[PDB]
Amino acid sequence: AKMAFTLADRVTEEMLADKAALVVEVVEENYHDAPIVGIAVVNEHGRFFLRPETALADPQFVAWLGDETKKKSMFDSKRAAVALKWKGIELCGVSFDLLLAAYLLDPAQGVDDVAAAAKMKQYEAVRPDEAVYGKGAKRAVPDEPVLAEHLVRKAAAIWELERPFLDELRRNEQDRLLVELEQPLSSILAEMEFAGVKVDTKRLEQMGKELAEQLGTVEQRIYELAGQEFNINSPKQLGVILFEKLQLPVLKKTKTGYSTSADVLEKLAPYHEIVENILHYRQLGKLQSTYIEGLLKVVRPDTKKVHTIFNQALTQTGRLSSTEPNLQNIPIRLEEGRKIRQAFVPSESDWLIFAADYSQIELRVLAHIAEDDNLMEAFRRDLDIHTKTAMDIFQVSEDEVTPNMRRQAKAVNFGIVYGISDYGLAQNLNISRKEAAEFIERYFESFPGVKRYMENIVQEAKQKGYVTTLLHRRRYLPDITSRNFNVRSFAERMAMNTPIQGSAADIIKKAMIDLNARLKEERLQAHLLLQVHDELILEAPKEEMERLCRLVPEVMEQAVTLRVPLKVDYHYGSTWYDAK
DNA sequence: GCGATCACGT
DNA sequence: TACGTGATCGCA
Numbered sequence: 001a002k003m004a005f006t007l008a009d010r011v012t013e014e015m016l017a018d019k020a021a022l023v024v025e026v027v028e029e030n031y032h033d034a035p036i037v038g039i040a041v042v043n044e045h046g047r048f049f050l051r052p053e054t055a056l057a058d059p060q061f062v063a064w065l066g067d068e069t070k071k072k073s074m075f076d077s078k079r080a081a082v083a084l085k086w087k088g089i090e091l092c093g094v095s096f097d098l099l100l101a102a103y104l105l106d107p108a109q110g111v112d113d114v115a116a117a118a119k120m121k122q123y124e125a126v127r128p129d130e131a132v133y134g135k136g137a138k139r140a141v142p143d144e145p146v147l148a149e150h151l152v153r154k155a156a157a158i159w160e161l162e163r164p165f166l167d168e169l170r171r172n173e174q175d176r177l178l179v180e181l182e183q184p185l186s187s188i189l190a191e192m193e194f195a196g197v198k199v200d201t202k203r204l205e206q207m208g209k210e211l212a213e214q215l216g217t218v219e220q221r222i223y224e225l226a227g228q229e230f231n232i233n234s235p236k237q238l239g240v241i242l243f244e245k246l247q248l249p250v251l252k253k254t255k256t257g258y259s260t261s262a263d264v265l266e267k268l269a270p271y272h273e274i275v276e277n278i279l280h281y282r283q284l285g286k287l288q289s290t291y292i293e294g295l296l297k298v299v300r301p302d303t304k305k306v307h308t309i310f311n312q313a314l315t316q317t318g319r320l321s322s323t324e325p326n327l328q329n330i331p332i333r334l335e336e337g338r339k340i341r342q343a344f345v346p347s348e349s350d351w352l353i354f355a356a357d358y359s360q361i362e363l364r365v366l367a368h369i370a371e372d373d374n375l376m377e378a379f380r381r382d383l384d385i386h387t388k389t390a391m392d393i394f395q396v397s398e399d400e401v402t403p404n405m406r407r408q409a410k411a412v413n414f415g416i417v418y419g420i421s422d423y424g425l426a427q428n429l430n431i432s433r434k435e436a437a438e439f440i441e442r443y444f445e446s447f448p449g450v451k452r453y454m455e456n457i458v459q460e461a462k463q464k465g466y467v468t469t470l471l472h473r474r475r476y477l478p479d480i481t482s483r484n485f486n487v488r489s490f491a492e493r494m495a496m497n498t499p500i501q502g503s504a505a506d507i508i509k510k511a512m513i514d515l516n517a518r519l520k521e522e523r524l525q526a527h528l529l530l531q532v533h534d535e536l537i538l539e540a541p542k543e544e545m546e547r548l549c550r551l552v553p554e555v556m557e558q559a560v561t562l563r564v565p566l567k568v569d570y571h572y573g574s575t576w577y578d579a580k
Numbered sequence: 581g582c583g584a585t586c587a588c589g590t
Numbered sequence: 591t592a593c594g595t596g597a598t599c600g601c602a
């Protein structure tokens with residue numbers, strides 16, 4: 001069974017062919033400034049294993065790695081590229097990434113290692129990484145004999161599976177999606193992650209001090225109002241203090257007891273003064289624990305930068321996710337938490353943070369896909385879309401639209417995009433079911449094209465077995481035919497929403513690629529730092545702001561051409577908070 | 581360790 | 591109502 005390969009003590013010419021499956025192993029989940037434990041190369045001349053100290057010190061190998069004409073097939077090339085960047089080594093010529101290929105073929109498989117991807121094609125001559133390295137406390141690099149065969153088997157799998165995966169991608173019309181979108185994007189993400197974002201740690205530490213004080217205060221007030229101490233951070237103990245010791249009304253229940261979600265607490269506020277305090281305490285506690293303490297834990301002490309990792313092969317819709325730290329969920333709704341952004345600053349003196357965001361990209365994408373005359377016209381006039389919906393569903397002139405009417409029309413717009421049900425619309429607007437249903441009905445009368453799209457997309461999902469996005473990304477929906485109403489309904493909402501969220505994902509990804517090409521042509525020093533679903537955050541010399549104000553929005557607006565215009569707003573300042 | 585519940589983002 | 595990450599609790 002053992003697979004044959006050369007355990008090389010030195011790099012040789014035949015190891016540098018112009019086409020090879022390459023494995024540059026980084027076992028640490030967070031690959032930033034992490035160790036490379038081994039290298040495997042499989043090509044026309046055979047299978048090879050190279051120790052990193054050797055390979056990475058060989059100028060011929062390093063040259064081969066950076067030679068864009070020497071093509072490499074890999075799995076999670078971003079991981080290798082970044083780990084190499086920290087060692088001052090450039091990786092070029094990656095023409096096939098099995099992780100991204102598998103992700104595009106079926107995001108639902110959750111492929112996160114070569115073995116998982118290989119299984120899709122009935123290839124099982126490779127072990128799962130977890131089986132080799134273990135997990136958690138037991139996770140460690142095996143002895144060279146075991147490590148070497150594993151890396152060679154992974155490279156061998158990649159070598160064998162490239163053609164099969166490319167053939168299916170082609171059949172799915174996703175060949176360009178991999179080659180012209182995801183693979184180029186992977187390199188851009190590597191640059192962004194490697195660059196990192198500078199943090200004003202002293203500012204965060206000061207906020208932490210101010211929060212600790214406020215928490216202690218509110219914390220005491222809570223015990224005083226409850227005439228006793230308990231773990232406020234325990235939905236369990238809290239549920240007892242509120243619904244048992246204080247007799248507060250039980251408006252909502254959970255799977256294991258009473259609900260203490262902010263949602264319910266808001267309704268309970270009128271009954272007792274402790275509720276407001278619990279809400280406030282949670283607000284502050286989230287800021288302290290997740291953001292202040294959290295960020296401080298991952299900031300690099302030497303550079304004061306945080307280096308997130310953008311998981312490019314995880315979400316079912318094509319969006320990216322961000323981890324350790326997640327820089328796509330930094331507070332902004334509430335002013336107090338929003339101030340956390342004042343701690344994200346430019347990495348160099350006299351540089352500024354520039355942020356550009358698409359305005360209502362989901363609803364604009366919906367107008368395009370559904371080809372709804374009323375909705376397309378609304379955007380062609382660049383109308384306030386929520387006021388417009390209110391005018392239509394409540395039958396009133398612009399002047400007759402009250403704040404509450406807009407607030408509700410807004411909730412309906414978001415619900416439509418999410419495939420909201422008459423019930424979930426009530427839960428959100430805290431209204432009835434038949435009422436929320438009447439709203440939805442009024443919406444479809446005003447936007448018949450959208451109603452038709454929602455009906456047609458669900459039928460298409462049932463017929464084909466999947467739905468697709470603008471750039472041909474796909475998501476299988478087997479539950480669309482489930483005879484269990486709830487399971488089927490969730491699938492139906494996904495059928496309606498995925499093409500919208502997914503196409504919006506496609507668009508900003510292409511914008512990022514187009515943008516970097518533009519930045520290079522103009523030789524601007526400006527560069528991307530983050531992507532937050534419908535917005536791009538960059539940093540650049542103050543002298544480049546005027547050029548960026550015109551360049552960034554244009555590139556983002558022209559990424560794709562829809563039946564309605566794409567609109568991008570932008571702001572810049574001395575900190576992320578100020579880029580408003 | 582892991583499911584349940586909470587809260588942060590688009 | 592769509593899509594995420596993660597801190598904390600509590601029993602295994």
Ligand SMILES: OC[C@H]1O[C@@](CO)(O[C@H]2O[C@H](CO)[C@@H](O)[C@H](O)[C@H]2O)[C@@H](O)[C@@H]1O
Pocket residue numbers: 029030031076079111112113309311312313314323
């Ligand atoms: O390197 C990112 C890439 O690796 C996968 C596994 O193939 O995720 C690993 O790394 C992430 C970043 O540290 C972790 O969040 C995740 O837990 C770990 O398995 C892919 O999912 C991802 O695309």
Ligand SMILES: [Mg+2]
Pocket residue numbers: 357358359360534
């Ligand atoms: Mg926006």
